[PDB]
């Protein structure tokens, strides 16, 4: 089997991407944030605290003939940005782009943090990291990909995120028309439950490539590119007037700037992030200070190749017995 679904930016800045997902019978379609940095499939629901729902589409398990309470199971997750959600668990039929999993754990939110309430466009998350990170207790549950894998033509999924445009998540096949040149594969460590890999270095604009190992995660659920302070300083030093602002919470730059590109290494291959991908616009409406898309990972504890990086590439998440990651230009 295979599946193929379009993923769409939630706003003009590509702050996140949503992908329609069919849950239950008859189908209830919710727009979920596919997140290769976490491993829970959770949804706004008929059980979510009423005051914490503001415009989201909800899953109502009582209206699904295939829903079953997973008795005694609860979940609770806290994300790196400080957001969180928790609740109980149903199993139900879940389909993405024509690919169907029966008996998928659908984690129904009873509580969500303010950041989720305040974003009407995200109806929940669909985790695509390793199932060892799944938070369901007392019986840990599998991700949608883990459940689908044995049925797939090939045990892979691909992320093809657009810059200010829709893109595609494919399951079970590699679309050889979706990228240019060749795909370069690189080793993955699953020890922390992430798609963790080591970049071979970077360049800023037309500058020389610096060979240096940068361990980090491929994370579709994180907006920005978070890298070591040394690397980030070297980037922003090439932008007149750019500075790190403690009050804003990262590097800002004059909105009048033309940003340089940023290149990262994948083995001997190179992925170029155009400068425009690094512009996240005014810090507040009408401001001439703009927020940068490359930020320091210092104090996160891990480097994160988020959407800023991934949308410059066609990315293969290879879930073979020994997982790997592939990157191609596009």
Swiss-Prot record:
Quick one: a GO biological-process term for this protein? proteolysis
- Active-site residue numbers: 35, 199
The first-level EC class reads: hydrolase
Keywords from UniProt, A to Z, are:
Aspartyl protease, Disulfide bond, Hydrolase, Protease, Signal, Zymogen
Task: Write down the EC number.
Answer: 3.4.23.22
Output this protein's name: Endothiapepsin
* UniProt gene name: EAPA
User: Which species is this record about?
Assistant: Cryphonectria parasitica (Chestnut blight fungus)
Q: Which GO terms describe its molecular function?
A: aspartic-type endopeptidase activity
Query: Which cysteines form disulfides?
Result: 255-290
- Where do the Peptidase A1 domain residues begin and end? 17-328
Q: Which domain of life is it from?
A: Eukaryota
Recorded catalytic reaction(s): these are: Hydrolysis of proteins with specificity similar to that of pepsin A, prefers hydrophobic residues at P1 and P1', but does not cleave 14-Ala-|-Leu-15 in the B chain of insulin or Z-Glu-Tyr. Clots milk
Q: Which family does it belong to?
A: Belongs to the peptidase A1 family.
């Amino acid at each position: 089997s295979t599946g193929s679904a379009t993923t769409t930016p939630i706003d003009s800045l590509d702050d996140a991407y949503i992908t329609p997902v069919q849950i239950g019978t008859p189908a209830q379609t919710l727009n979920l944030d596919f997140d290769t940095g976490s491993s829970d499939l959770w949804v706004f629901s008929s059980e979510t605290t009423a005051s914490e729902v503001d415009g989201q589409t909800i899953y109502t398990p009582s209206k699904s003939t295939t829903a079953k309470l997973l008795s005694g199971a609860t979940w609770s997750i806290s994300y790196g940005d400080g957001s969180s959600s928790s609740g109980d668990v149903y199993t139900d039929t879940v389909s993405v782009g024509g690919l169907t999993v029966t008996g998928q754990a659908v984690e129904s939110a009873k509580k969500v943090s303010s950041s989720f309430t305040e974003d009407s466009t995200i109806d929940g998350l669909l985790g695509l990291a390793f199932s060892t990170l799944n938070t369901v207790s007392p019986t840990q549950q599998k991700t949608f990909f883990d459940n689908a894998k044995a049925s797939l033509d090939s045990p892979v999924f691909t992320a093809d995120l657009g810059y200010h445009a829709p893109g595609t998540y494919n399951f079970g096949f590699i679309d050889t028309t979706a990228y240019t040149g060749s795909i370069t594969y690189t080793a993955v460590s699953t020890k922390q439950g992430f798609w963790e890999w080591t970049s071979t270095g970077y360049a800023v604009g037309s500058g020389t490539f610096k060979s240096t190992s940068i361990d980090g995660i491929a994370d579709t659920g994180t907006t920005l590119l978070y890298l070591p302070a040394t690397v980030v300083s070297a980037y922003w030093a090439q932008v007149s007037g750019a500075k790190s602002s403690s009050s804003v919470g990262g590097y800002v730059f004059p909105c009048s700037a033309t940003l340089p590109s940023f290149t990262f290494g994948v083995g001997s291959a190179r992925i170029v992030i155009p400068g425009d991908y690094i512009d996240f616009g005014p810090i507040s409406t009408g401001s001439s200070s703009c927020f940068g898309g490359i930020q320091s990972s210092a104090g996160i504890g891990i480097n994160i190749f988020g959407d800023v990086a991934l949308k410059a590439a066609f990315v293969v998440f290879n879930g073979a017995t020994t997982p790997t990651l592939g990157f191609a230009s596009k």
